[PDB]
Design a protein around this nucleic acid. Structure first.
Ligand SMILES: Cc1cn([C@H]2CC[C@@H](COP(=O)(O)OP(=O)(O)OP(=O)(O)O)O2)c(=O)[nH]c1=O
Ligand SMILES: OC[C@H]1O[C@@](CO)(O[C@H]2O[C@H](CO)[C@@H](O)[C@H](O)[C@H]2O)[C@@H](O)[C@@H]1O
Ligand SMILES: [Mn+2]
Length: 580
DNA sequence: CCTGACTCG
DNA sequence: TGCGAGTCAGG
């Protein structure tokens, strides 16, 4: 009662059925240009293991991999597709992805390997990757016999688990979410990641040289003001300087000691001008370590491109995340940091960068879901709640509202709708707690629909134990009925936010699928490069800008039909920076 | 390896 | 005492 399989030395016709569980093993966490250590195939005819050098050089196997009519069931097909792209091979026909299936059933399980998915169905005939490859410096590919069995067992699990997972997804009304959204999206993300984004290293490097000089100046200035030399990047050392040497008041403490957070330092500005210099130093230091040095470290020298990896099965709300490098958190709020974007350029001769951003996205989604008359009316009148809130908070006229003021108001708007307390708001706007409370109270008096929705969604979560999004994404909240006030409150706030942020994620994901389809149909050369939660970034020859200015906004705005209209802002230019 | 600092949505 | 993320230097 074990698991017999074949360790083939050549490709046979039987292992090329029109349906099978396929394992194309890429052990390196970052699969870009990473080695494929082994292949496994399980179908109606049997179980097979193939060495990469064998299978990938076989004309029939390569043809099979690229045959869309030959359906494959896998785990993390994007990892396989990309790794194969780097090997010059195209993968088609992926009909089921166990990773995405597990992710949709319950994001909280943190499924990261076949074994973890299998556990959801009490399937034991497979071991966890870590148990096979090892941890850290001990991580290595085992002897062929061991490797082969593992890959085959993972293929066997995928083969036996497909039906059970599709079954539970259907019951949860998430089967289409998988097959028509996440899986198609996965292929689109694979293309985006492989294409990469070109970097102007000469300019980036020059920026780093100049930035290093500015840092040295701010650094010395800080020591001068402190009357002592110390490690500014050490909250511990900085705390001694600020709260022990300079005697500044302690406004907050964490479990390790005095807090030197940006919020605390800003509140200390009236006492000593050293805190402002420190804030500036930390800003510049981050740009240098992360957006200059860190970014240069991941640039592929030969092409000057960076290839991020969009984790599609990680966030608890359905959003994507971006790693090594994270291209979803590149500076833009402050002018100094924003310049880093001048280093992100088109990959071709006379191409340009085109960026589209959903206007007040989650407020529009909230209007729809909460069905708040006043909020829905506002969007039907095409108003800007962020600007309006800015006008009130700063007590200024619309024309006076600066981009930075709107941004601060935007943070306030979402903080309030998502349950910020009067304490939190008073601290953020450094204003009276009573006034903050009044502002919040008044805020919901104007948007009574939103208030009741938030109260109802919390009660619903307590009764059902989970919340859902527009396209049926789900998130369980077991802590929602906890005895502990803190534990419970956090769960209640998740119930308030997840459905909104999650539905916003559903929308942009559908937009990406529709756009990719529209682009291909019109044979446009324009292609997606990045997704930044509620914005899409593309590159395309200058001649296509005219079409994009209409095609991109239209597709994104028509992705889904809500009670309120969806609006998209867009721009383009020679660099990401200019796409403003 | 952990915090706490910075970055973005 | 709003939510969701990732990377870095210092300990
Ligand atoms: C910045 C920010 C954003 N979010 C969530 C919810 C909004 C989405 C999209 O961000 P965006 O700045 O475009 O917001 P949008 O409302 O789309 O603003 P624009 O009209 O696009 O400028 O991310 C948040 O929770 N807290 C924040 O401070
Ligand atoms: O291939 C991405 C996919 O793999 C998982 C593990 O199943 O994450 C791995 O790869 C990521 C990208 O390099 C790393 O950030 C992560 O540390 C590594 O375990 C999934 O989480 C992800 O969806
Ligand atoms: Mn937006």
């Amino acid at each position: 009662a074990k698991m017999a399989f074949t360790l083939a030395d050549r490709v046979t016709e039987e292992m090329l059925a029109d349906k099978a569980a396929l394992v194309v093993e890429v052990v390196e966490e970052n699969y870009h240009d990473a080695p494929i250590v082994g292949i496994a195939v399980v179908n109606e005819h049997g179980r097979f293991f193939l060495r990469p050098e064998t299978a990938l050089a076989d004309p029939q196997f390569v043809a099979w991999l690229g045959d869309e009519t030959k359906k494959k069931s896998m785990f993390d097909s994007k990892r396989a597709a990309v790794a194969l792209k780097w090997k010059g091979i195209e993968l088609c026909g992926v009909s089921f992805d166990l990773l995405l299936a597990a992710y949709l059933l319950d994001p909280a399980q943190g499924v990261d390997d076949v074994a973890a998915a299998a556990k959801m169905k009490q399937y034991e005939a497979v071991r966890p990757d870590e148990a096979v490859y090892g941890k850290g410096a001990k991580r290595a590919v085992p002897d062929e016999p061991v490797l082969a069995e593992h890959l085959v067992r993972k293929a066997a699990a995928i083969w036996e688990l497909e039906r059970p997972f599709l079954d539970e997804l259907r019951r949860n009304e998430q089967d289409r979410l998988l097959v028509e959204l996440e899986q198609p999206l996965s292929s689109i993300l694979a293309e985006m990641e492989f294409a990469g984004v070109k970097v102007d290293t000469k300019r980036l490097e020059q920026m780093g040289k100049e930035l290093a000089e500015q840092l040295g100046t701010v650094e010395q200035r800080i020591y001068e003001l402190a009357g002592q030399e110390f490690n500014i990047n050490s909250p511990k050392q900085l705390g001694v300087i600020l709260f022990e040497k300079l005697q500044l008041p302690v406004l907050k403490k964490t479990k390790t000691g005095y807090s030197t957070s940006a919020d605390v330092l800003e509140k200390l500005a009236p006492y000593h001008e050293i805190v402002e210099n420190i804030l500036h130093y930390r800003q510049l230091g981050k740009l240098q370590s992360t957006y200059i040095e860190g970014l240069l470290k991941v640039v592929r020298p030969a092409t000057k491109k960076v290839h991020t990896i969009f984790n599609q099965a990680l966030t608890q709300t359905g959003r994507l995340s971006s790693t090594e490098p994270n291209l979803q958190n590149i500076p833009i709020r402050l002018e100094e940091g924003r310049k880093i974007r001048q280093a992100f350029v088109p990959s071709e001769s006379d191409w340009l960068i085109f960026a589209a951003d959903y206007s007040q996205i989650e407020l529009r989604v909230l209007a729809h879901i909460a069905e708040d008359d006043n909020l829905m009316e506002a969007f039907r009148r095409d108003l800007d709640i962020h600007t309006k809130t800015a006008m009130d908070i700063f007590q200024v006229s619309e024309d006076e509202v600066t981009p930075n003021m709107r941004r601060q108001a935007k943070a306030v708007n979402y903080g309030i709708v998502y349950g910020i307390s009067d304490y939190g708001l008073a601290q953020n706007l450094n204003i009276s707690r009573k006034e903050a409370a009044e502002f919040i109270e008044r805020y919901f008096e104007s948007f009574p629909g939103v208030k009741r929705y938030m109260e109802n969604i919390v009660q619903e979560a307590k009764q059902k134990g989970y919340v859902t999004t527009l396209l049926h994404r789900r998130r369980y909240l077991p802590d929602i009925t906890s005895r502990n006030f803190n534990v419970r409150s956090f769960a209640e706030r998740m119930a308030m936010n997840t459905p909104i942020q999650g539905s916003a994620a559903d929308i942009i994901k559908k937009a990406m699928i529709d756009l990719n389809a529209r682009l291909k149909e019109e044979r446009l050369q324009a292609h997606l490069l990045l997704q930044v939660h509620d914005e899409l970034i593309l590159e395309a020859p200058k001649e296509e800008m005219e079409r994009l200015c209409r095609l991109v906004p239209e597709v994104m705005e028509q992705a889904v039909t809500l009670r309120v209209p969806l609006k998209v802002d867009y721009h383009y230019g020679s660099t990401w920076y200019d796409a403003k």
